[PDB]
Amino acid sequence: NIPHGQCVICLYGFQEKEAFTKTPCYHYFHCHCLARYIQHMEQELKAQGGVQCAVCREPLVYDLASLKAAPEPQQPMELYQPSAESLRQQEERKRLYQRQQERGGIIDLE
Amino acid sequence: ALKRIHKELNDLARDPPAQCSAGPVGDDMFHWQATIMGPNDSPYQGGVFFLTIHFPTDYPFKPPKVAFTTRIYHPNINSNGSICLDILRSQWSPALTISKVLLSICSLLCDPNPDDPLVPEIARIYKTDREKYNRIAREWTQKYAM
Numbered sequence A: 001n002i003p004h005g006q007c008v009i010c011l012y013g014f015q016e017k018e019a020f021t022k023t024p025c026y027h028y029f030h031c032h033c034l035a036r037y038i039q040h041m042e043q044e045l046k047a048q049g050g051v052q053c054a055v056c057r058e059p060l061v062y063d064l065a066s067l068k069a070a071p072e073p074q075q076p077m078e079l080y081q082p083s084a085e086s087l088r089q090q091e092e093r094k095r096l097y098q099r100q101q102e103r104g105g106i107i108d109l110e
Numbered sequence B: 001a002l003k004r005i006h007k008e009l010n011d012l013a014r015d016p017p018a019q020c021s022a023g024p025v026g027d028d029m030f031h032w033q034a035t036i037m038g039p040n041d042s043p044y045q046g047g048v049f050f051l052t053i054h055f056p057t058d059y060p061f062k063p064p065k066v067a068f069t070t071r072i073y074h075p076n077i078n079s080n081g082s083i084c085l086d087i088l089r090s091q092w093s094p095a096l097t098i099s100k101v102l103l104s105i106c107s108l109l110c111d112p113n114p115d116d117p118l119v120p121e122i123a124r125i126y127k128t129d130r131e132k133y134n135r136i137a138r139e140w141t142q143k144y145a146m
């Protein structure tokens, strides 16, 4: 069947027709998402001198090539539409920032 | 990175960590401004603190760069606003989110780590004379963040 939760790498859920996988530590990721994470970690570890689960740090077993072969999920981008209330809150923050500047309370870094 | 950043933005817009906010600087989805209200269990109570967040190209696999813009007296935060916090360096993971990072910084304000300081004089005072330390931290909060 299809899991009801979310992939923590991309923040989207799962749909039939999508390619996804489950780890031995019971965590679900899209195959595409997990492949990107593993590639990055292998690079970092080498520069230091054993890739761990993003969620729980258990060492993973995997075949990177098999994960890479899966199709990337088609996921429409989530439009950003600030509510009326959030716009009001933004205005108040602007007033507070202006006072901090006047006090010499804002770090410049020239 | 962009689809991930849009997902996060919408989730912080509808359910932000208590007393925090975050969103884009103008039109640039990769540069955000955040605010933290000073925790009530800290000498920063009453202050509003601004922070800058810059997302790297390879987000969420590399950490965001987070710094204080508002001046603050703390053993782990220096005069450039740099923050000594493990999850922003050695302990980053893509399971973390900007929402979780703000929560962690709130915790650090309540409870400093003076054995790994960015400011040795402030660490010394925190360890040998806590009364003097909270007095000075309150003094800076009142002058700069209120």
Ligand SMILES: O=C([O-])C(=O)[O-]
Binding pocket: B139, B140, B143
């Ligand atoms: O920190 C300062 O410079 C002060 O308290 O005047």
Ligand SMILES: [Zn+2]
Binding pocket: A007, A008, A009, A010, A011, A012, A029, A030, A033
């Ligand atoms: Zn995913």
Ligand SMILES: [Zn+2]
Binding pocket: A023, A025, A026, A027, A053, A054, A055, A056, A057, A058
């Ligand atoms: Zn796991």
